[PDB]
Amino acid sequence: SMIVVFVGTAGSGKTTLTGEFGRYLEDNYKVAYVNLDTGVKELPYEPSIDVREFVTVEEIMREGYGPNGAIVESYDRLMEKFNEYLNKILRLEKENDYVLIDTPGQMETFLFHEFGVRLMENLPYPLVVYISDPEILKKPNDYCFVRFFALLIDLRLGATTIPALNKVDLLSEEEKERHRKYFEDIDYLTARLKLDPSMQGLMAYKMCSMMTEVLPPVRVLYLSAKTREGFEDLETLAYEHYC
Amino acid sequence: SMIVVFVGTAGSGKTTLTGEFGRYLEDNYKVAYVNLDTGVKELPYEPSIDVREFVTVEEIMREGYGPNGAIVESYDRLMEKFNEYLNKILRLEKENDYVLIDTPGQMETFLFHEFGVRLMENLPYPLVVYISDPEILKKPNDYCFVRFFALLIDLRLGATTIPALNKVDLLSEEEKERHRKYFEDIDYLTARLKLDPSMQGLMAYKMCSMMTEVLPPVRVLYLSAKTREGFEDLETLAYEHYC
């Protein structure tokens, strides 16, 4: 029962949120941890599955591989244990209320390599949580970018993907609210995309402007591993997705 | 004049295509090369700009950084030379008919870090070419994924982005044509997205089904650095974009 997958650019906090959301859930639930990151040093949780026991980036780099070569090469090698890791995960799923899956440092390793894609395809209705550093959020279209990236992850992995900001504890309340408006109120971002004479911006207005198509929900989550902000919302979204 | 930016997942062939398309253009043009990849070993072209002269991944890794940490950290450090590298590029642009920009091994380093984003934002109408390994191409929605990823890069960088497959020389003519149908004929992919009862697939049908919205063009390029397939089409698209 319940498999939640944390997905995000390096630095966004996937690992931190896996550990901390896990501890949060370990008050009322059976929780298992799955590390799919080959090039990670230390984990704040204790994994039932650690792909580092099979291969690691740096170890492959001692063969003359560049960093971006040893990463890619590490996931080529993991395919040797594709079926083994899949069945292990399916087994954890029967033994726990939550399996939390921590992904490769770079999300493109997950999204573009066969390992992650095929793992996700053969898993029972996993929930993806796609987390962003609010720091990426400058111009109006950034907001549109976030929501479309989630849709794309959703397309690519064939799993419901929840868009989330992490580290919201670092935000001033000004910034806090400034993001909510754009993310909450739709007609608001849309307005700010209107007064954009430039090439891109109109391109984004005409995009997100579908509102009907897109899909009513996909309210954005505000999480923080530090204050545990948002965890109850996530917990809620996950049982709701399981329903 | 003409700045073309190669963007793609690690392994897709950005560097190879930069060198080879450069040589192709160096029969009729003045061409400059720009390496923005900090963690790259050897280049098949001679760069006017090499960000490795300032920082490199592996060098930062000898400070205790994990691979995905030293990558990210390398682009934090490049911001110290943001304005310097920008003006250098703007100068190459006045001295050449083509500036070819080779990007970070991982495209998320480019798409999510301030360096790449702000560089692209302050450049004159650059053309992005987004290249994919045909190997990613299995199910119908993969095809929709490619075209939407380009749109997103386009959104995120504020530059026209041309979707391309690279290494098409590796394809059998069966596969060759199989991809063209899906990519060429729209109503064709759309048909194959129809007979999809599953959650994702309908989600993708209802997506790409806009056809009116999206935007008529964005015909996909078939490139190969080995046979120089597609180069004349690229060359053509680039002067056409410059128009």
Ligand SMILES: Nc1nc2c(ncn2[C@@H]2O[C@H](COP(=O)(O)OP(=O)(O)OP(O)(O)=S)[C@@H](O)[C@H]2O)c(=O)[nH]1
């Ligand atoms: N203030 C604040 N910092 C956070 C939060 N979550 C993570 N961080 C910090 O961000 C940095 C990156 O966290 P991390 O969990 O490693 O990201 P990741 O790269 O996506 O995950 P991984 O590749 O290690 S598995 C760490 O220093 C971490 O402590 C948060 O909610 N609030």
Ligand SMILES: Nc1nc2c(ncn2[C@@H]2O[C@H](COP(=O)(O)OP(=O)(O)OP(O)(O)=S)[C@@H](O)[C@H]2O)c(=O)[nH]1
């Ligand atoms: N058959 C074939 N192989 C190619 C082609 N282009 C690149 N390759 C091969 O693919 C591998 C990856 O190429 P590369 O140019 O390094 O990709 P990249 O990672 O995106 O670029 P970079 O990070 O080095 S800057 C190399 O072995 C290269 O020779 C092609 O058009 N056809």
